[PDB]
């Protein structure tokens, strides 16, 4: 429960206060915010709770204290690789993503834990998702911010999907759990999902491969568009 995981990282409130201080320094924000109070609402969101008993309503004071107007049309959905998703948003800083949003710039590459009894950070151990339980607060936060960002996405989506695994599009990811259900086809029309031939591909007949053919099988019964440009 508590154990069998890597715990909280070192210098947690100093890196939270520094990170978004760089955000109100570099970006002239549409409200200049109290970076200290952001961390107090973050502390009240999860602190001294049971790791595998965390729901989504604990995090909405943070999400209503971080209300951005993420520009629609210029959006990007990522999955699988993080380094090439980082290089694709470094070539694509016009098209804003979850590693360019305020809340992703707050809690990017961070994990947190906390023992249930008293006010302390559990620095040593961590609730893993498969091995302990999938209600840990890091996956709660990433589910909430990918739901809000994929709901307010609009016009043209450009998903990067690697093929280094045998499962190119796995069903049980956050992409195929909340993102492709709330892609909202009244404002999105065309979906240029960009399959990657990097790594080790499962099969030939690329773009006739079976999991991206299952996504080419249109989930929306309005039958909004699907497309699949490749990267060799």
């Amino acid at each position: 429960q508590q154990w069998s995981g890597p715990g909280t990282t070192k210098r947690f409130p100093e890196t939270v206060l520094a990170r978004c201080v760089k955000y109100t320094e570099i970006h002239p924000e549409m409200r200049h915010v109290d970076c200290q109070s952001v961390w107090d609402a973050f502390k009240g969101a999860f602190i001294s709770k049971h790791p595998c008993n965390i729901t989504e309503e604990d995090y909405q004071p943070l999400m209503k204290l971080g209300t951005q107007t993420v520009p629609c049309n210029k959006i990007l959905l990522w999955s699988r690789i993080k380094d090439l998703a980082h290089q694709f948003t470094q070539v694509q800083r016009d098209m804003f993503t979850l590693e360019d949003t305020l809340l992703g710039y707050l809690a990017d590459d961070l994990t947190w834990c906390g023992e249930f009894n008293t006010s302390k950070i559990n620095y040593q151990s961590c609730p893993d998702w498969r091995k302990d339980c999938s209600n840990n607060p890091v996956s709660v936060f990433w589910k909430t911010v990918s739901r809000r960002f994929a709901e307010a996405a609009c016009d043209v989506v450009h998903v990067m999907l690697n093929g280094s695994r045998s499962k190119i599009f796995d069903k049980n990811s956050t992409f195929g759990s909340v993102e492709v259900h709330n892609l909202q086809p009244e404002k999105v029309q065309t979906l240029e999902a960009w399959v990657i031939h990097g790594g080790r591909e499962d099969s030939r007949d690329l773009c006739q491969d079976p999991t991206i053919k299952e996504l080419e099988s249109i989930i929306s019964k309005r039958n909004i568009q699907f497309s699949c440009k490749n990267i060799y």
């Epitope: 320094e25 924000e29 549409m30």
Partner: antibody, heavy 118, light 112 residues
Framework: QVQLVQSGSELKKPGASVKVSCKAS????????VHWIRQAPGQGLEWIGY????????HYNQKFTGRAVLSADTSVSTAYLQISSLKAEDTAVYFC???????????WGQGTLVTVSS | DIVLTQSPASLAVSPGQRATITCRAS??????????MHWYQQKPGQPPKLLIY???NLESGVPARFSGSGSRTDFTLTINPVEANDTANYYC?????????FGQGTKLEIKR
């Protein structure tokens, strides 16, 4: 097309409270900010402070703190400004301004001359 | 704040010739890869139509006569083919720190 339209000229007494009102047309109101910018006549320009109409989140300049109380209405799509307890040196022209970010101003209102005398 | 003062106080240029309306910051406005220096052209009886913002970007709808170069100290605004309808004030404006004070202006007039 995107446009802005603000209220007309006002002759104020010393001690009175100005209430400038704009009106945003051509675009959805919840996306961008509504700044305010001064012009004393024959002089330079001076920033006041900007409103955020998504959740009511204001931010003023350090000189105009307390005097300036920004507000809006999300249904009627009108921005606001209020400076109270006026005096004779504060006769100027104010403009409502939308920026693409904070730190730019492409779109403007037409101008409002307020004059303080008795 | 940051206090900025416009270094040519006036100009009188006949058309077909060039002009230079510069200003000088007290410190660096250029931090972390952004510089904030935004010039603004203001004719009388007209609120300022936006010019070169973040020291490079000519806005769409503005003519391509204008060429503005911003830095950490020196901010020139040169107009090479000046015309008869350019009789306006040319403010500068920074936005690096949270005080967002402007310049003070420069009365450009046309020599005839």
């Amino acid at each position: 097309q995107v446009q802005l339209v603000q209220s007309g000229s006002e002759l104020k007494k010393p001690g009175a409270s100005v209430k400038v009102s704009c009106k945003a047309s051509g675009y959805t109101f919840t996306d961008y900010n509504v700044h305010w910018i001064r012009q004393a006549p024959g002089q330079g320009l001076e920033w006041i402070g900007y409103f955020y109409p998504r959740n009511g989140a204001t931010h003023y300049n350090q000189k105009f703190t307390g005097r300036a109380v920004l507000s809006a209405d999300t249904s009627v799509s009108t921005a606001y400004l209020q400076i109270s307890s006026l005096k004779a040196e504060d006769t100027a022209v104010y403009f409502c301004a939308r920026g693409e970010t904070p730190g730019t101003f492409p779109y403007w209102g037409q101008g409002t001359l307020v004059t303080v005398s008795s | 704040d940051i206090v900025l003062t416009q270094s040519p106080a006036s100009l009188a240029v006949s058309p077909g010739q060039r002009a230079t309306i510069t200003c000088r910051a007290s410190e660096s406005v250029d931090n972390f890869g952004i510089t904030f220096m935004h010039w603004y052209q203001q004719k009388p009886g007209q609120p300022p139509k936006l010019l070169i913002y973040r020291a490079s970007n000519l806005e769409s709808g503005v003519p391509a006569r204008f060429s503005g170069s911003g830095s950490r100290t020196d901010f020139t605004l040169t107009i090479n083919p000046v015309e008869a309808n350019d009789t306006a004030n040319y403010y500068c404006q920074q936005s690096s720190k949270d005080p967002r004070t402007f310049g003070q202006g420069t009365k450009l007039e046309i020599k005839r």
